[PDB]
Design a protein around this ligand. Structure first.
Ligand SMILES: CCCCCCCCCCCCCCCC(=O)OC[C@H](COP(=O)(O)OC[C@@H](O)CO)OC(=O)CCCCCCCCCCCCCCC
Ligand SMILES: CCCCCCCCCCCCCCCC(=O)OC[C@H](COP(=O)(O)OC[C@@H](O)CO)OC(=O)CCCCCCCCCCCCCCC
Ligand SMILES: CCCCCCCCCCCCCCCC(=O)OC[C@H](COP(=O)(O)OC[C@@H](O)CO)OC(=O)CCCCCCCCCCCCCCC
Ligand SMILES: CCCCCCCCCCCCCCCC(=O)OC[C@H](COP(=O)(O)OC[C@@H](O)CO)OC(=O)CCCCCCCCCCCCCCC
Ligand SMILES: CCCCCCCCCCCCCCCC(=O)OC[C@H](COP(=O)(O)OC[C@@H](O)CO)OC(=O)CCCCCCCCCCCCCCC
Ligand SMILES: CCCCCCCCCCCCCCCC(=O)OC[C@H](COP(=O)(O)OC[C@@H](O)CO)OC(=O)CCCCCCCCCCCCCCC
Ligand SMILES: CCCCCCCCCCCCCCCC(=O)OC[C@H](COP(=O)(O)OC[C@@H](O)CO)OC(=O)CCCCCCCCCCCCCCC
Ligand SMILES: CCCCCCCCCCCCCCCC(=O)OC[C@H](COP(=O)(O)OC[C@@H](O)CO)OC(=O)CCCCCCCCCCCCCCC
Ligand SMILES: CCCCCCCCCCCCCCCC(=O)OC[C@H](COP(=O)(O)OC[C@@H](O)CO)OC(=O)CCCCCCCCCCCCCCC
Ligand SMILES: CCCCCCCCCCCCCCCC(=O)OC[C@H](COP(=O)(O)OC[C@@H](O)CO)OC(=O)CCCCCCCCCCCCCCC
Ligand SMILES: CCCCCCCCCCCCCCCC(=O)OC[C@H](COP(=O)(O)OC[C@@H](O)CO)OC(=O)CCCCCCCCCCCCCCC
Ligand SMILES: CCCCCCCCCCCCCCCC(=O)OC[C@H](COP(=O)(O)OC[C@@H](O)CO)OC(=O)CCCCCCCCCCCCCCC
Ligand SMILES: CCCCCCCCCCCCCCCC(=O)OC[C@H](COP(=O)(O)OC[C@@H](O)CO)OC(=O)CCCCCCCCCCCCCCC
Lengths: 69, 69, 69, 69, 69, 69, 69, 69, 69, 69, 69, 69, 69, 69, 69, 69, 69, 69, 69, 69
């Protein structure tokens, strides 16, 4: 695929925001949810799941560029 | 089928955009939705489903050209 | 039925366009809709439905010629 | 009824065109509409309805000749 | 009523044409309209209505002769 | 009521067609719809409903003749 | 009211046809519509509504004669 | 009922297609849906339901001919 | 039933794809789901259920051809 | 079955990924879950279950190709 | 209220049919639905609910005559 | 208000029919609808609602005469 | 305003009929409509709306005389 | 109640089918469901519940005739 | 009850399949489940329960025919 | 509040029926449900809850009159 | 409360059936459940609970009449 | 606000009916619904909610007069 | 804006009626609707919404005068 | 209580089956369970408990008839 065109700026902004401020906000929300739901039932496995999800988010642009030429 | 004609340019643009900027934008939206919905209920299977959907998108032009001569 | 006559050219163009550029454009639109609606609710069954619809489109001329003599 | 007379040629042309080029054009339009409306809401039942309508078109001359002597 | 007189030939021609070539042409037009309007909104009930109308046309002479002595 | 008159032939044809070819076509359409809608959500109760509807169709002439003298 | 006069024959024919051949034809049309619309959405309540309507038709002459002296 | 008439060919085609190519296509769609929905929640009871539905389809013509004379 | 006709090609493609590439893709999805859901709760019985479902898929064409003549 | 066709690339990618990077990621997740759940209740049998599941994953393509021709 | 008048026959027929053939048909449909829905989830309480509904139907005329003078 | 005048007879007939034959027919229709809709989803609360509606019908004349002097 | 003049009698008759026989007839029609539409969908809120409308009708003359001097 | 009338044949067919072929089919479906759901969780109490339901089905006509006069 | 009618073939097939191939498949599934669940917790009582369930399946047709006349 | 007015009769009937025949019917239904649901899971606490609910029903009119002046 | 009225017959039937045939059927079901669940875990206390529940059923009418005047 | 004017009588009637006969009827309906829905699922919290709603109804006029001057 | 002019009286009446008799009538209707819809589904949040709406109505004149000079 | 009525046959069958074939089957299951669970831990007290349970089953009809009049 080609990253340029009429929608090149939108794709660039989305890719930068995936690991940028919106992605960091979503990760912080994940951490907040993990901490909050652990008040009654402490479960640190959800922290590992959130870490894996943040790892996927960090590699989301690479996966998208690999699958879509 | 024949890729040329009066609508050849439209079909060419659509095929290139399927794996181009609009397709990448839709894939990034899929990743964003997967990350967002995992704040409360972490589910990494939806990431696999999104990967399969991006794989289908990458092969969409081939499928269309195979089915429609 | 007879494929010739005053409307022979129109019927020929429609039959060729069913599996030609307009049909391919409609199939690409189907794929785009399937990818877009899967952002929030990933459902790969709609991809199978779209594949079946493209299969019907590929055989549309044969069905029409079989039913209408 | 009698197929001859002053309007025999018009009736003959209409009967031949029902399963001829105009009928095939209308059937192709039915297929195109079914494919187009399935982009957002894939519904293959309309394909069955269109097949039944083409079956009725193929037997339209027989029905007309049976009802009208 | 009496079928003879100065207008006997006109009445005879009209009665024969009701189920003859003009009636068959009108029935074929009904079928064409049913097929055409079903491209966007497939509705096979109109086919049943057209069949009933052709049944009425086939019995039009009998009804007229029964009502008018 | 009286089954004869100017509209006796139309009523006779309608009564015979209720359990005849058009009624059988409608019943086959009911079966096709039941089979088609069961692809995604298998529901055999609709088959029982269709059987009851065909039973009503078989007794439609008797009901009409009983209600209308 | 008085059933005789200049329009006595017309009123007599209408009253006899209400439960006669035209009324039976309308009832058969009701049954056909109920069967046809039940192909996609089986609803046997419309059959009960049609039965009530035929019951009203059977008593239409009595109602008219009661209201109009 | 009588299988002949103006709509005899349509009824014959529908009856043959119920257990013919369209019926087989619908059954294959049932099998595909059963296999697809079993990816996340394996449920082999739906396979039994589909088998019963195909059994009903195989006997649909017999049921219709029994109910409608 | 008869495998030929206007829909013979569609039925042939569906039957070949049931045990072909789409069926293999669905089976691989079944295996992926079984492996993924076993991360937290290892359950190898779902593997046996998936094997039985693939066995049913392999015999789907035979079952359909046996039930539908 | 045939591994080629319109969906040949998708099936090839899925088969290679079953024992490739996604399969290895799922196996590593299995190991992580086994290690994590053993903090409070050490149970090494789940390690054997995970080893068996990885063995099934390694032979998943062979099983699918054997069952689906 | 008064049971006579222009609509006396309609009311009499409705009251007799409430506990007559149509009411018995509706009760048999209730029993059939209770038996059918108990295939997957056996629930005999719905049988008691249906018995209570039939009891209400048996006393429907009395209730209507008591409320409406 | 005054119950006499040019429209005194119409008002008297309407008031008597509210709790008379037409009102009883409407109440019987309510009972029939309650029984029919309870075939699939037994709900006896609708019977209580219908009883309340019949109670309102029985007191409709009193309410109208109280509000309108 | 002044209630006398050339149109004093018409205004007096209209004001008396608002809460007189025609108003009572309209209120009875409201009650009949509420009872009839509640056969399929029992909704007693429409009864409250009708009561409010009758309350407005009872005070219509006062409102008109207050607004128009 | 009276078993005769316009709907006497429908009621007779329903009563005979309650303990006839459709009732036996529903009972066989109950047995199949009991056997199938006992693969993972063997529960023979559901067999007793199904036996009680078949006992109710055998006495359904008697119950309906007792409740509805 | 009567084993013949429109649904005689369906009932015959279901009765033969209860102790035929589908019943044997369900029994083999019962045995497989008993063997599989005994890997961690060996319990041979479930084998006796499965034997009793197969005994019930073998006598299912007799029970159904005894309860339903 | 005032118990008289246009709706005095409706309120009186509702208050008398709360502890009258409809209230007793609802209480008997409560007892029947308690007995029925205790077949599998005997729970006599629901009997105490039903007794408390009947106590509330007996005092419903007093509560309503106390809250609403 | 008053046992008479429009719902007097329904209340009488429910009260008689509480200790009549339906109540005896529910008690027999309780005994059957107690015997069945005692195959694996013999517990005769559930028999005492069922006896107490039958005692409550025998006094249900008295309790309802005492609470509801 | 001012309670007088052209709509003073309507407002006075509505305020008196809020805690009068219509309000008492609505409260009795609330109690009936609470008792009815507690047959299957006894929930006395809905009684407390209904008591709070009646408390709000008793103070509705005060709230309206406080908010609207 | 200026409150005087040709339409000063109309604006004054509307502003006074917003918090006057018509506004109070609308608020009482809101309370009645909240009480009525809470019979089946008790929801006291709608009471808070109605209170907020009455608060907006009380400040409607101030908002209008602030926005429109 | 009365043993007759609409449910007299069901109650008679249940009472006869309590000490009949189903009761004997349940008792044999009790004996089989006692023998099976005694392989590892021989406990003949469970045999006495089963004997007491069979004694209760033999007197179940008497207890039910004594408690329920
Ligand atoms: C960075 C450090 C390493 C990362 C952490 C290690 C992995 C941790 C996972 C196991 C923790 C176990 C205790 C969890 C506690 C727990 O209850 O988890 C709950 C969570 C949800 O799982 P299910 O939906 O199966 O849960 C159903 C219920 O059990 C609800 O919990 O489990 C997972 O997410 C497991 C899947 C992660 C493993 C699968 C990963 C492979 C799929 C993704 C591959 C990439 C796809 C890319 C797409 C673009
Ligand atoms: C690239 C790496 C390999 C790809 C990933 C591996 C496959 C992953 C699938 C299983 C993950 C299981 C956990 C998911 C978590 C989950 O809940 O998923 C939810 C998602 C939606 O499934 P349903 O609509 O059945 O879900 C109903 C509810 O369960 C909602 O979840 O499941 C799927 O998409 C399964 C279908 C994928 C498998 C079918 C693929 C074959 C059809 C497409 C073939 C191509 C068609 C082409 C048309 C042109
Ligand atoms: C090429 C590979 C093989 C093709 C793919 C295999 C078939 C896939 C179908 C099942 C996927 C199930 C999951 C879908 C997910 C899903 O939700 O689907 C939604 C889609 C719409 O179905 P309904 O309108 O019943 O849906 C109502 C709601 O459920 C909305 O989804 O379902 C279908 O299209 C089923 C009908 C396809 C099967 C019928 C085919 C036979 C009719 C056409 C025969 C030809 C007519 C020719 C006329 C000229
Ligand atoms: C050649 C292969 C066999 C043909 C295909 C099998 C029949 C397919 C019908 C059912 C598919 C169900 C899913 C459809 C999906 C669907 O939504 O359909 C929509 C379409 C329109 O129906 P309605 O107007 O009832 O729909 C109202 C809304 O539901 C809009 O859909 O339904 C039909 O056409 C049903 C009538 C066909 C059955 C009636 C046929 C008998 C009348 C014609 C007899 C001949 C008259 C001759 C006059 C000369
Ligand atoms: C021949 C064998 C015996 C016939 C089959 C047995 C009856 C089967 C009915 C119950 C199956 C339950 C599962 C269905 C699955 C289901 O969902 O059904 C859907 C279908 C539509 O019902 P509703 O419109 O209430 O459904 C609203 C939604 O639930 C949509 O399903 O239900 C019925 O048709 C029930 C009415 C049949 C019973 C009423 C019959 C009495 C009225 C007709 C009397 C004759 C009138 C003659 C007029 C001339
Ligand atoms: C050929 C081999 C023998 C056939 C297979 C044996 C029967 C299998 C049924 C039980 C499997 C249980 C596990 C299923 C898993 C399951 O969840 O099923 C789901 C499916 C839908 O049932 P419901 O709509 O009750 O489900 C509501 C939810 O539970 C959704 O599942 O259940 C049925 O279809 C049961 C009805 C079949 C039995 C009724 C048959 C009698 C009616 C048809 C008679 C012919 C009518 C002819 C009209 C022309
Ligand atoms: C190729 C090797 C042999 C195949 C594997 C052996 C059979 C394995 C089954 C037992 C494993 C037990 C542990 C599973 C672990 C487990 O939890 O399973 C879950 C799965 C779903 O069962 P249910 O829906 O009863 O589960 C409800 C909950 O328990 C969810 O698990 O169980 C089955 O699929 C049992 C039915 C298979 C047996 C029925 C087969 C007969 C019906 C199909 C016959 C063909 C129909 C053809 C239609 C065209
Ligand atoms: C003749 C023998 C005696 C009759 C049977 C005894 C009563 C049986 C009721 C309890 C069985 C409990 C297990 C059911 C299993 C069950 O799930 O039931 C479902 C059914 C529907 O109830 P809901 O709509 O509350 O259910 C919501 C969900 O739970 C869906 O089930 O429950 C009822 O019908 C209870 C109301 C009957 C009791 C109210 C009767 C009083 C109102 C009618 C009075 C006459 C009005 C006349 C108007 C003209
Ligand atoms: C004679 C015996 C005593 C009468 C029966 C007792 C009252 C029964 C009501 C509750 C049953 C609850 C279960 C129902 C089951 C149910 O689903 O009901 C459905 C039905 C419709 O309510 P909605 O439109 O709120 O329903 C929306 C959806 O929930 C559809 O059900 O509910 C009502 O009618 C409640 C209103 C009756 C209570 C309001 C009465 C006060 C207004 C009328 C006052 C007179 C106006 C006179 C104007 C002239
Ligand atoms: C012919 C031989 C004698 C028949 C068998 C003996 C009765 C067997 C019942 C107990 C078995 C216990 C183990 C079951 C295993 C089990 O889990 O059962 C499940 C099944 C469903 O009960 P529930 O809906 O209470 O279950 C909620 C969950 O526990 C799901 O199981 O239980 C019943 O059906 C009990 C009701 C039968 C007893 C009530 C009968 C009286 C009502 C019907 C009277 C006739 C109404 C006629 C209307 C026309
Ligand atoms: C006449 C003799 C004395 C009456 C009986 C004594 C009270 C019995 C309650 C405890 C029995 C415990 C075992 C039950 C077994 C049981 O499972 O109960 C189930 C039932 C439902 O409770 P929940 O909805 O909390 O249950 C959620 C799940 O646990 C389902 O059971 O519990 C209650 O009803 C408790 C509330 C009664 C106590 C609250 C009463 C105060 C509120 C009503 C005050 C009047 C409001 C008037 C409005 C107009
Ligand atoms: C007179 C005696 C004292 C009154 C009773 C005490 C309060 C009872 C409430 C708690 C009972 C809990 C168990 C209920 C059982 C239950 O399930 O309730 C269901 C009912 C509906 O609540 P939701 O819509 O949140 O429920 C969603 C689902 O849970 C459906 O239940 O809950 C309430 O109404 C709670 C709100 C009452 C508390 C809020 C009051 C403040 C708002 C109103 C203030 C006045 C507004 C005036 C506007 C003009
Ligand atoms: C006087 C005492 C304090 C007032 C009450 C406190 C506020 C109560 C609101 C929350 C209650 C939540 C439970 C409700 C239960 C509920 O279901 O509510 C339903 C109602 C309708 O909301 P939607 O249309 O979002 O609902 C869609 C569905 O959920 C239908 O309910 O919700 C609201 O009105 C929320 C908006 C109020 C909050 C927005 C206020 C700000 C906008 C107005 C500002 C002034 C505009 C002036 C223009 C001139």
């Amino acid at each position: 695929g080609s990253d340029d065109g009429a929608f090149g700026d939108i794709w660039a902004y989305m890719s930068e925001a995936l690991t940028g401020a919106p992605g960091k906000i979503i990760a912080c929300g994940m951490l907040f949810s993990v901490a909050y739901f652990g008040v009654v039932k402490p479960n640190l496995g959800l922290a590992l799941v959130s870490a894996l999800m943040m790892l996927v988010m960090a590699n989301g642009e690479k996966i998208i560029s690999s699958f879509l030429g």
